[PDB]
Design a protein around this ligand. Structure first.
Ligand SMILES: O=CCCCC[C@@H]1SC[C@@H]2NC(=O)N[C@@H]21
Lengths: 507, 91
């Protein structure tokens, strides 16, 4: 046959991956093939593939036989466009050697990552792989490291997104951990370093793959995944939606798109949302929905550490990050998991020039020996450092309580915040009124009159307002308008810091 | 209205223009009663709701043309959202 005909033969073979029977087996599991996933994710007719004909070079254990040669070698890589914006994508092909990672696999992934870093565009990885290709021995390990390094080199330069759509075990799990966001598909994807068999053999524990590393486990217990989706199709649609928010690189400002919601729209429904009695809770998500454009909010880790809320939204068409206390869960007290969840989100938002909006209602930190033995001190320091380090515009609104060091942590103006607002129900104090009266006036019998005077003078936002700790006390209904105005003024904020290789954040 | 028809038409229009969010509400039933051919003819009694909806209220029932109009509106809205998704500012 001529060279051309062999070219068509190779193209056709590559387009089928591991064979039609393998594709059918993949489909009966309820999973799409890599190329189908790429087709769903990218704009139609925009996918440009790279390295179609690359094949593995292993020569051991009969790996050099023609039946062991697959063009592409279990990964499809290239570039495309989402809503017209450039992106680089790789998708792992489970039908070729179970999607195991080989030298060529890592080489292709590294090529696309280098291209993306060179031009400054995000990287999306659809992960479905058993693990390292044992037949290539140490070679596979090297490839993994080659990926890891690039991830670390790309951190804070271009956004990186991982979507776990199948089995993922061993060292391969670490690359998604190094990316900015990880999404999981329910019932068909899992993450764990060691499989259930080794767990049973070593620790005598009985567990299934779903229990060990299922999407629910990593979205509700381990705090490893950020979102879980029902299907591949649903996951890909939501992935496009989410990608619409991010900037292409750290050299670009926060994306601003066409907006129809007026920036001065009033929100009268917030004037009575906060109950007067501090013993009743409300839903901060309602406030967030009311304030943001079109009531649209993309929440991150919605089912993990629910006492805090983090997500993406738009104000006047500009992407913003939302962080808020949730009084509806555990009184809105901070703790370990919530601290970590807020801290990493804040750091990501700051790294890519996304302004931050914070809603503060926090009585303090969760007490108990479990929190202390778990290292609550360093975990809370994580969030405090995250707010203190950020140089993007920061807008804070206090709805109800802000007590003790929790007030400092939640982007207090003393952390070089930009604008801080207090609703009429705000309470900035060192601690509760009863405890403060107990400490201050203890040893005096006329406790009642002193306590009444103390509550009249201090159980309100006046102590902070008179000192300038809050820029103003605003009617809740105007909240949105105020915020929008500020975000227009602060778009050109620039801050000078001392030079350093990097900081040393608590871990 | 100046006559019964004008009053019933302005009502139907008013019920379609009424925004209520955060609770469920009876506007769908009210709107269906007002346009019902018995109600419009004045063929009504204290049993009207039980006679007109014996099985229960299932909401409006679309005629082929109404279904096509609804589908077209939904498709246009979907396409409009998709199109607005592509309108970034200059980079
Ligand atoms: O039983 C109630 C008396 C003590 C409650 C103090 C609460 S627990 C949540 C918050 N964090 C603190 O450190 N104190 C308050």
């Amino acid at each position: 046959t001529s060279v051309n005909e062999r070219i068509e033969n190779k193209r056709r073979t590559a387009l089928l991956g591991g064979g039609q029977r393998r594709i059918d087996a993949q489909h009966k599991r309820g999973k799409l093939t890599a190329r189908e996933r790429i087709s769903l994710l990218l704009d139609p007719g925009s996918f440009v593939e790279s390295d179609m004909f690359v094949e593995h070079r292993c020569a051991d254990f009969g790996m050099a036989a023609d039946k062991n040669k697959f063009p592409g070698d279990s990964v499809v890589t290239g570039r495309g466009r989402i809503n017209g914006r450039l992106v680089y994508v790789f998708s792992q092909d489970f039908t070729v050697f179970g999607g195991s990672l080989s030298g060529a696999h890592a080489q292709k992934i590294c090529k696309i990552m280098d291209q993306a870093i060179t031009v400054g565009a995000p990287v999306i990885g659809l992960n479905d792989s058993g693990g390292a290709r044992i037949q290539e021995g140490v070679e596979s390990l090297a490839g993994y490291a080659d990926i890891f390094l690039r991830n670390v080199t790309a951190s804070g330069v271009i956004p990186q997104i991982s979507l776990i759509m199948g089995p993922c075990a061993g060292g391969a799990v670490y690359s998604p951990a190094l990316t900015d966001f990880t999404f999981m598909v329910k019932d068909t994807s899992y993450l764990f370093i060691t499989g259930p068999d080794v767990v049973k053999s070593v620790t005598n524990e009985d567990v299934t793959q779903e229990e060990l590393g299922g999407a629910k486990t990593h979205t509700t217990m381990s705090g490893v995944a950020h979102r879980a989706f029902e299907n591949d199709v649903d996951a890909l649609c939501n992935l496009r939606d989410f990608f619409n928010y991010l900037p292409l690189s750290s050299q670009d400002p926060a994306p601003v798109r066409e907006c129809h919601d007026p920036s001065d729209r009033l929100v009268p429904e917030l004037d009575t949302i906060v109950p007067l009695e501090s013993t009743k809770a409300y839903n901060m998500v309602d406030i967030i929905h009311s304030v943001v454009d079109e009531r649209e909010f993309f929440e991150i880790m919605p089912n993990y550490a629910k006492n805090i809320i983090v997500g993406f939204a738009r104000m006047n068409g500009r992407t913003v990050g939302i962080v808020g206390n949730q009084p509806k869960v555990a009184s809105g007290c901070l703790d370990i998991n919530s601290s970590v969840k807020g801290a990493r989100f804040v750091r990501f938002c700051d790294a890519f020039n996304i302004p931050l909006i914070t809603f503060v209602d926090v009585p303090g930190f969760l007490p108990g020996t479990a929190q202390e033995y778990g290292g609550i001190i360093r975990h809370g320091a994580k969030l405090l450092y995250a707010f203190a380090e950020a140089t993007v515009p920061k807008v804070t609104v206090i709805t109800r309580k802000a007590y003790g060091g929790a007030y400092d942590v939640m982007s207090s103006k003393h952390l070089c915040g930009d604008t801080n607002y207090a609703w009429p129900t705000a309470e900035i104090a060192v601690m509760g009124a009863k405890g403060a009266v107990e400490i201050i006036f203890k040893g005096h019998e006329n406790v009642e009159a002193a306590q009444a005077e103390y509550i009249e003078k201090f159980a309100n936002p006046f102590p902070a307002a008179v000192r300038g700790f809050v820029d103003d006390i605003i009617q809740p209904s105007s909240t949105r308008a105020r915020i929008c105005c500020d975000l227009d003024v602060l778009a050109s904020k620039k801050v000078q810091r001392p030079w350093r290789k990097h900081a040393n954040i608590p871990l | 209205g100046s006559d019964r028809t004008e009053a019933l038409k302005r009502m139907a229009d008013a019920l379609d223009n009424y925004v209520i969010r955060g609770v469920t509400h009876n506007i769908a039933l009210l709107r269906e009663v007002i346009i019902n051919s018995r109600f419009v003819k004045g063929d009504i009694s204290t049993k009207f709701l039980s006679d007109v909806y014996p099985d229960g209220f299932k909401g409006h029932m679309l005629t082929k043309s109404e279904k096509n109009q609804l589908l077209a509106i939904a498709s246009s809205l979907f396409v409009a959202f998709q199109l607005r998704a592509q309108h970034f500012q200059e980079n």
